[PDB]
Design a binder for this molecule. Structure first.
Ligand SMILES: Cc1cc2c(cc1C)N(C[C@H](O)[C@H](O)[C@H](O)COP(=O)(O)O)c1[nH]c(=O)[nH]c(=O)c1N2
Ligand SMILES: Cc1cc2nc3c(=O)[nH]c(=O)nc-3n(C[C@H](O)[C@H](O)[C@H](O)COP(=O)(O)O)c2cc1C
Lengths: 177, 176
């Protein structure tokens, strides 16, 4: 029940964004990537053409994020937001930790038509991982509000909770050693 | 200046989820020319109640001498600055303002405008740093839209601003 016009608005927001953005079709269980912006493409080292149609787990290897994935599947089925860290791999197979922000888009409250994903690459920010992650959270919420997934009046409150959630996750991630 | 570019700034201002202000550098007293709804909501004034005036009404005379010195230098230089001001709402409630300053377009050392973005400190419990860094992240997005932050070196621009914001917060907490 989503206007071709909204889909295009989302595409335009992805294209101009300063954070990695992905969109996945929820109308089918294989859940293919349907949008993926330039910063996601550079972080991972793929091209847009080779990525679309695939499920985003192609960034993973085997059975590696068992906990994080079980959480992701629930969020998705329950149509809820989620932040989780994931062990991921670029096209060249180097490992990287991906702080993943998930957000339901469109559809109905417990049946979103799409899911948005935004990736924050950990370990690139040195002494200020919390701040960087939180900064990312802020730019994200701005994108969410422009699309309309976050209510405009609630953009601030959303940002504050998402930034906090990101800093916490970083802190637990640097508690892993 | 420009009619197309000023219209864009007005547009970005109206939609935004961050407190935004635009000051006209071409006027003797450097007055508010734009003031967006989350700014008005934070301070409790209306558009008409504050437009055309300089933002120094949020202060009570002499309380931010060092900071306003840093502000005047920045404005003269046309450089960015992040600074904490003691401020007062329309109902005279006091709050500390973490103020973000940015030069808008024009000339590198004499800009057409300054963009101010206010972040209220002390309403974020144990995660002031996170919330400030979040604010900086959102701001940078708006600056990238206006055109001030070029391209998508926005990311590194975001990371630094967020780093700076968090630092300023820590200092402000080392000052009980
Ligand atoms: C919008 C969006 C974006 C992403 C994902 C999901 C969605 C909906 N997923 C998760 C992946 O697609 C898959 O759901 C999880 O691996 C769990 O499902 P499985 O346990 O593999 O069946 C994901 N996976 C990953 O390893 N890195 C990521 O950044 C992406 N981003
Ligand atoms: C764009 C912009 C936004 C500003 N926002 C605030 C503000 O929110 N709160 C405040 O106390 N001062 C703010 N100021 C500062 C005053 O406008 C003024 O520049 C500063 O107080 C130093 O000037 P003065 O020493 O001549 O009073 C802002 C200035 C500019 C240029």
């Amino acid at each position: 029940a989503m206007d071709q016009k909204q889909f295009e608005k989302i595409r335009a927001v992805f294209d101009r964004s300063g954070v990695a953005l992905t969109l996945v079709d929820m109308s089918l269980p294989e859940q293919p990537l349907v949008l993926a912006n330039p910063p996601f493409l550079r972080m991972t080292g793929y091209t847009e053409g080779q990525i679309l149609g695939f499920n985003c787990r192609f960034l993973q290897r085997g059975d590696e994020n068992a906990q994080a994935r079980a959480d992701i599947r629930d969020a998705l089925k329950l149509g809820r937001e989620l932040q989780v860290v994931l062990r991921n791999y670029r096209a060249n197979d180097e490992p990287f930790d991906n702080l993943l922000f998930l957000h339901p888009v469109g559809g109905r409250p417990d049946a979103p038509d799409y899911f948005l994903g935004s990736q924050f690459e950990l370990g690139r920010s040195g002494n200020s991982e919390e701040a960087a992650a939180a900064g990312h959270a802020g730019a994200l919420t701005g994108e969410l509000a422009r699309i309309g997934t976050v209510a405009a009046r609630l953009e601030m409150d959303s940002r504050r909770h998402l930034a906090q959630a990101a800093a916490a996750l970083v802190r637990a991630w640097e508690r892993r050693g």
